[PDB]
């Protein structure tokens, strides 16, 4: 059976403090005895601002029961730094948390704080940890955001080598090979190739990028991720749509389309969007209007209103 904390010798000097949401609170939660007891003693610990091993243990007890308790996580990090605890041990514990299914805004943020404070000369092993944690959960938003932070933070300190950037791109290419519809990995490619301050932009660089984008579209013509990336790419580098049009035209009816792969019904609405936009680039507003009208009335009827708006813009 559970032993209450009022009965533990290690906690005898502490007077627990009850939760104070007044009388008759709304949205009350039915708490386990274990959670109530831990929190009663946490309220006492936190009120007296005790920074101790027992307080550290208590915060672990609590966040295991409730991984989203941001106050307790905040108190846990204060304890780690006051007590000058091994932050590497704490990262291992955060790993052990992962093996036991515990996750949140808070667990990843704690990890970030740990990495920031440890400030390793080479963050490679955390990079590898992050990669491993994504394989079973490839679109985990906070994990992708954490990866962006890690590279961005450690690069500002000059700690990301060219070999490291290179292998990161290799890993990203593999993510997109396994699932070309993984928009999170397309986002990461964008950081690696376009937005990060150290990224290379030469005529060859733009060439290579265009080849990769076009090959991706040709592999999966209906993949919205690849189209958005194409459009993002052209816009960002002020490149005309027209010279690439031959590679897109067959989807409306440098690497060119395959006979098209099976299960590729035409037209691809985003190919038509590309065609309409290219007409606008050419000042051919009536031709663009016509394409928008077809998008509206026939080929992408869910957005009938938006495509009509685009049509009216022309006329």
């Amino acid at each position: 059976t559970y032993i209450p904390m009022s009965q533990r010798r290690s906690w005898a000097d502490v007077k627990p403090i009850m939760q104070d949401d007044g009388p008759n609170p709304v949205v009350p939660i039915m708490y386990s005895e274990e959670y109530k007891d831990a929190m009663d003693y946490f309220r006492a610990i936190a009120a007296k601002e005790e920074k101790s091993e027992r307080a550290l243990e208590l915060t672990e007890i609590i966040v295991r029961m409730n991984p989203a308790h941001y106050t307790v996580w905040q108190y846990r990090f204060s304890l780690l730094t006051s007590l000058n605890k091994s932050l590497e041990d704490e990262l291992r514990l955060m790993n052990e948390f992962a093996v036991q299914n515990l996750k949140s805004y808070q667990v990843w943020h704690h990890r970030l704080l740990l990495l920031d404070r440890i400030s390793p000369q080479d963050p490679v092993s955390e990079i590898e940890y992050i990669h491993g944690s994504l394989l079973p959960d490839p679109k985990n938003y906070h994990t992708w955001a954490y990866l962006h932070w890690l590279y961005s933070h450690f690069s500002t300190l000059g700690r990301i080598s060219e070999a490291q950037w290179g292998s990161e791109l290799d890993w990203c290419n593999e993510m997109l090979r396994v699932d070309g519809r993984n928009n999170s990995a397309w986002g990461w490619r964008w950081y690696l190739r376009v937005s990060r301050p150290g990224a290379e932009t030469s005529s060859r660089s733009l060439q290579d990028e265009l080849i990769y984008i076009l090959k991706s579209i040709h592999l999966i013509p209906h993949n919205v991720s690849a189209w958005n990336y194409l459009r993002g790419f052209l816009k960002h580098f002020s490149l005309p749509l027209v010279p690439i049009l031959p590679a897109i035209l067959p989807y409306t009816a440098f690497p060119m389309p395959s006979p098209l792969p099976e299960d590729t019904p035409l037209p691809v609405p985003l190919a038509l969007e590309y065609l309409a936009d290219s007409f606008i680039e050419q000042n051919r507003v009536d031709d663009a209007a016509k394409v928008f009208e077809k998008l509206s009335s026939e080929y992408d009827q869910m957005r009938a209103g938006y495509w009509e708006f685009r049509r009216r813009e022309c006329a």
Partner: protein, 482 residues
């Protein structure tokens, strides 16, 4: 009204094509397509007079949803122990949308509960102030909940909020980072949800200052991705030499970014707020509306799945994106911008719990309903049912009636020159901010109530997400305009 908003039942339902390249994404998508189309196939077309025999009736089951919200919470809710103000908000806002009044006694319990979450040093936490530190997100949720359930009397909580203005402001300033980001709490994550929640509260309580807002526009603007939506945060490279978005465009962060940016457009600072690409944001928004096979619900990001909560996060950002696009087109120099009919159909047919059960609304078929999806489905439904515009002539009318001689005490800035330069500037700011906060209108004749008028819920306000009838007297109280 509906020429450019076709019913899902009038369109051909086709799976997302494979292009002969299978992937994990496509497998989940196909499975979701099957689930939703199957429920649509079992359900009578809400638009039909001959309400079909043997098929499920899609009418909004308001009483079931009310019963769901009424009902102490079980042990499983410990995962939301640091989000109790959200539980209050999802409940009281849904009840407002559903047209159900709380009695004064219950409203008083709501107010008293929330005030127990307020720390003397500033801000609301996710629970009692003796237990939890202040956090930007429950500060938004508690503030809005007080707008819904509170009043100007001595027991109505508004008076307590007014007295708390300086400490709340000081909490907001403690959260502030030099790059324009805010931590959500002491030692907490920096993201645009915090920015959104802070700007809503600062707007409502008359605690906006120049020092509060410095760089905040820049942080938000750099959240915009190549897809046109917004990520959780931007990273400042060393104020900064450059800022870079830190993840994908997501409906949650796009809603928060558009709303934040929108709130900043009424602040009379020079060259502020830094622009966003409004066209790209509108494009991203409309592109997230699902196909007929997935019921016309919104997904939250490219190549993931439709989900009822995005009716609010993405659908509710549409009028904001639309207004920003409209302004950009005026500064250079009408059909619905999303399928308002289909979104309602998703809500009625797919997002409601199956009839005669617990009630509540949900992410998608196969998911348990919950308070969050109830609130966000209904909030999005409201945006689809009612054409919301931000009206320049309404804003002008507001300017004309504003009384600058009335107001609560000015906030004392953290840094000596962190306030408005003078009293003319401060009053002009108060006027603009208040006048624009009250600029959202429901367009006469813009109403589309799929399935008949018994499905009608009340009109929520874009950006804020409380009813206009709550927003007006609440913000009037803090600006002494009543």
């Amino acid at each position: 009204a509906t020429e450019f908003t076709p019913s899902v039942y009038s369109l051909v339902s086709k799976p997302l094509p494979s292009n002969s390249r299978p992937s994990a994404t496509l497998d989940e998508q196909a499975e979701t397509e099957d689930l939703i189309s199957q429920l649509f196939d079992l359900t009578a077309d809400p638009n039909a007079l001959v309400s079909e025999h043997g098929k499920r009736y899609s009418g909004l089951r308001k009483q079931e949803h009310t019963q769901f919200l009424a009902s102490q919470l079980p042990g499983k809710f410990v995962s939301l122990d640091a989000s109790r103000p959200w539980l209050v908000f999802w409940t009281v806002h849904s009840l407002d949308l559903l047209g159900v009044a709380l009695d004064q006694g219950t409203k008083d319990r709501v107010v008293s509960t929330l005030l127990h979450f307020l720390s003397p040093k500033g801000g609301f936490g996710g629970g009692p102030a003796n237990s939890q530190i202040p956090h930007l997100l429950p500060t938004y949720a508690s503030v809005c909940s007080l707008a819904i359930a509170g009043n100007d009397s001595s027991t109505g909580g508004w008076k307590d909020l007014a007295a708390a203005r300086q400490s709340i402001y000081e909490f907001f300033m403690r959260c502030k980072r030099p790059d324009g980001g805010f931590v959500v709490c002491e030692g907490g994550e920096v993201d645009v949800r915090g920015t959104y929640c802070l700007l809503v509260v600062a707007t409502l309580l008359d605690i906006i200052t120049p020092e509060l807002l410095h760089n905040v526009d820049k942080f938000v603007s750099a959240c915009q991705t190549y897809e046109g939506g917004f990520a959780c945060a931007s990273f400042p490279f060393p104020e900064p030499s450059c800022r870079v978005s830190m993840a994908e465009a997501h409906g949650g962060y796009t809603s928060c970014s558009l709303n934040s940016h929108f709130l900043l457009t009424s602040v009379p600072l020079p060259s502020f707020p830094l622009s966003i690409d409004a066209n790209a944001a509108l494009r991203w928004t409309v592109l997230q509306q699902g196909e007929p096979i997935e019921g016309g619900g919104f997904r939250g990001r490219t190549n993931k799945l439709v989900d009822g909560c995005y009716s609010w996060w993405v659908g509710g950002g549409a009028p904001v994106a639309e207004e920003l696009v409209r302004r950009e087109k005026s500064r250079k120099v009408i059909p619905p911008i999303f399928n308002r009919v289909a979104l309602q159909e998703f809500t009625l047919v797919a997002a409601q719990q199956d009839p005669g059960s617990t009630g509540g609304l949900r992410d998608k078929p196969g998911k348990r309903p919950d308070q969050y999806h109830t609130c966000n489905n209904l909030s999005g439904l409201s945006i689809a049912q009612h054409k919301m515009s931000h009206s320049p002539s309404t804003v002008s009318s507001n300017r004309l009636k504003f009384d600058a001689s009335k107001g609560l005490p000015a906030v004392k800035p953290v840094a000596p020159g962190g306030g408005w330069k003078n009293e003319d500037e401060r009053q002009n700011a108060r006027r603009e901010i208040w006048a624009n906060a009250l600029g959202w209108i429901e367009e006469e004749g813009g109403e589309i109530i799929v399935g008949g008028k018994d499905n009608r819920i009340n009109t929520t306000t874009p950006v804020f997400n409380i009813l206009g009838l709550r927003l007006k007297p609440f913000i009037n109280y803090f600006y002494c305009q009543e």
